[PDB]
Symmetry: C3
Subunit: 167 residues, 3 copies
């Protein structure tokens, strides 16, 4: 009788503390023993959100569709980053060269080639690694590039209008 009272008090503490730990608006109802389902919002890649009613569904959505501000629309193999401090972003991206980035579907990394001259005094003649936007035969056109400084010191990229102008 005191034992019964002890149990119901304890199961209410169990219920409440499980509900607290879950968050997402979960609540415990001592009348039924039920924790109301949590609601966890995840961000789809198409400008919409999903409501998840379990932690596992939310975790799965995070991997399948990304997080807010970081979306890759794919079902293809995961990116692979094995280079030291390397970053691989998008389906089938591979960043195996150290201190490098592969970004874009199927992007790969190969070793940087130092270029000091070809015309001398090039800035950024000693690359730490590569920043790849694609792969051989699968190149990407880099777009919306502001005009870069044209100077001996400049490590800004140059755009097509600048090459147009010099010619």
């Amino acid at each position: 009788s005191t034992s019964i009272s002890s149990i119901t008090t304890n199961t209410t503490n169990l219920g409440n503390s499980t509900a607290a730990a879950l968050g997402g608006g979960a609540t415990y109802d001592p009348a039924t023993g039920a924790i109301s389902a949590p609601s966890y919002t995840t961000y789809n890649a198409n400008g919409t959100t999903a409501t998840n009613t379990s932690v596992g569904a939310a975790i799965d959505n995070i991997n399948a569709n990304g997080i807010k501000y970081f979306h890759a629309n794919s079902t293809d193999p995961d990116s692979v980053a094995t280079g030291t401090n390397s970053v691989a972003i998008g389906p089938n991206a591979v960043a195996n060269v150290d201190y490098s980035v592969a970004i874009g579907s199927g992007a790969t990394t190969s070793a940087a080639v130092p270029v000091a001259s070809a015309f001398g005094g090039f800035a950024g003649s000693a690359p730490i690694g590569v920043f790849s936007v694609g792969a051989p035969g699968a190149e990407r056109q880099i777009t919306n590039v502001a005009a870069g400084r044209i100077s001996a010191a400049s490590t800004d990229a140059v755009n097509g209008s600048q090459l147009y102008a010099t010619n």
Copy 2:
């Protein structure tokens, strides 16, 4: 009495297994029925971490502030990636062109324009898609670009010092 014993044994198994499933250092106390709150670390965008005491808080922080090594500082609309295998990163980024990337706040994607000549024998004359660092009137200056190979085969970007040198 045996029924009571049965229940307390079972609620301890419920408590322990709920605590196990939660992780984050959650523990069950049979004396009170309470699961001690989990502690889940998330990574803020400002070089600090947050301690979350529910799964929902942690999930919400992951979306709001990013994950370790992947941070976008914003409260603006989510990125949208609807192109096949496309990647959209940052607030208001839109990657609707297939096999493309939009990266940076407000970046957009338009179709790649194949360029074989303008001067002939251009490498990377058949782009698979675009890698956008911005949008018309909202361009980004691409910086810290190492000198690229200057050769007929080269699909390296060129920097401003290289254009400076050739002129």
Copy 3:
């Protein structure tokens, strides 16, 4: 006796609803009081997956090794994005300039330098910010860049073959 029945019914509802909220295939066994451990898949950076048997382990893996399609291979300090709407990706990346991107290990951002002429009529003469693939003395060679349009309007990046051709 009715009180006992009440409790076991309620603890089964507690068990089931905790198992539901957890997902990951967790199930409640009324015979033992045990919730079977959840299984949450996270994506490693090396082309493999991890099986996590707690929410906390899964959250920790998400931060340590990334999410599917978004991987940074590192144990170095977190990226920092403090610029308004800025994005910082990779270990030690810092995007403190507004509307900017730092991407790649140790990448930094400095203010964009508007360039209208150096040779006039440059497109993208008013950058909104920078897109940095590195830092001074730690530059990255940008690779697999498709040929950009060579025109007065062009904000496409140019590759080395294009500079080769014009020279």
